[PDB]
Design an enzyme around this catalytic site. Structure first.
Site, mmCIF file in Angstrom:
data_model
loop_
_atom_site.group_PDB
_atom_site.id
_atom_site.type_symbol
_atom_site.label_atom_id
_atom_site.label_comp_id
_atom_site.label_asym_id
_atom_site.label_seq_id
_atom_site.Cartn_x
_atom_site.Cartn_y
_atom_site.Cartn_z
ATOM 1 N N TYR A 89 6.906 0.866 2.981
ATOM 2 C CA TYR A 89 7.501 2.075 3.527
ATOM 3 C C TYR A 89 8.988 1.815 3.744
ATOM 4 C CZ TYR A 89 6.393 -0.271 8.108
ATOM 5 O OH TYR A 89 6.245 -1.126 9.181
ATOM 6 N N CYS A 90 9.771 2.887 3.760
ATOM 7 C CA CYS A 90 11.218 2.801 3.926
ATOM 8 C C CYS A 90 11.808 1.729 3.000
ATOM 9 C CB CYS A 90 11.570 2.483 5.384
ATOM 10 S SG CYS A 90 13.322 2.708 5.785
ATOM 11 N N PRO A 91 11.463 1.780 1.698
ATOM 12 C CA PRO A 91 11.976 0.797 0.741
ATOM 13 C C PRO A 91 13.479 0.917 0.533
ATOM 14 C CG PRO A 91 11.036 2.595 -0.449
ATOM 15 C CD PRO A 91 10.634 2.787 1.010
#
Length: 262
Positions: free
Chosen positions: A133-135
């Protein structure tokens, strides 16, 4: 001489929104050369910070309900990145310094990266972890598993390099919650952006990666020692009177924009 701000030991009422107000206040004061460079460490209770884009997903209300089902409060950060998890096992560090010629966006990311590697002195990569997530380009990982995420905030002549470090617990469990968020938020419908396709196994806490338990204070200590061992004179101080004024003003704006977005 760096200033150190300890926001790691407050109760579950200390909000991520307040934290945002602090970093903005620091960018403003350090940007006017009225404050020294500042290292600010912070921790918040069960919180999911959504990006502007996450909040506009087709079934967002169902997504937020699911997250409230996990006993996590939900807010949206105006400068949208993408959903990220905040809890007692997550240490956040904000390096706020003066914006200057020759100190690029990537220079800021590189500084934080070097800092982490030193705190844990060849295994740590700075590479986007697909599946997490939130790469981001500067995701930090070991053995291919993401344990930290970095972002940069620049306003009023100040630069805030921020990082969230997954210190204890399971990196995968945190991801499963976010995956569930996207499942209910997207709901098999078209979206306005390429949302992450969460693969829990690509994320892990430092405790899981290093093979031994670490708590937020251990990692905070490492950062403090690493900074002084490198020549910084760390001084534990509070905000000045003018900063408190900026803080209230910044918090009022931030707090209103969040209520709206929701």
């Amino acid at each position: 001489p760096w200033r150190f701000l300890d926001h790691t030991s407050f109760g579950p009422t200390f909000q991520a929104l307040q934290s945002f107000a602090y970093d903005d206040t620091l960018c403003t004061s350090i940007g006017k050369s009225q404050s020294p460079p500042t290292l600010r460490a912070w921790v918040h209770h069960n919180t999911v910070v959504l990006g502007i884009q996450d909040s506009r997903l087709p079934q967002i209300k169902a997504g937020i309900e699911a997250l409230k089902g996990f006993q996590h409060d939900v807010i949206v950060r105006n400068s949208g990145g993408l959903a990220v998890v905040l809890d007692s096992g997550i240490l956040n560090l904000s390096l706020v310094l003066k914006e200057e010629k020759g100190f690029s966006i990537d220079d800021g990311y590189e500084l934080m990266y070097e800092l982490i590697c030193s705190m844990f002195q060849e295994q740590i990569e700075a590479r986007e972890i697909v599946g997490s997530y939130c790469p981001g380009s500067y995701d930090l990982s070991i053995d291919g598993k993401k344990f930290a995420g970095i972002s940069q905030r620049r306003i009023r002549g100040g630069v805030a390099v921020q990082i969230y470090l997954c210190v204890s617990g399971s990196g995968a469990e945190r991801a499963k919650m976010i995956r569930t968020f996207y499942d209910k938020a997207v709901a098999g419908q078209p979206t306005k952006f390429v949302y992450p396709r969460i693969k829990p196994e690509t994320m892990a806490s430092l405790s899981e990666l290093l093979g031994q338990p670490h708590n937020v204070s251990d990692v905070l200590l490492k950062a403090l020692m690493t900074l002084q061992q490198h020549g910084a004179s760390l001084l534990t101080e509070s905000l000045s009177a003018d900063e408190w004024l900026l803080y209230e003003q910044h918090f009022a704006r931030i707090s209103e924009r969040n209520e709206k977005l929701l």
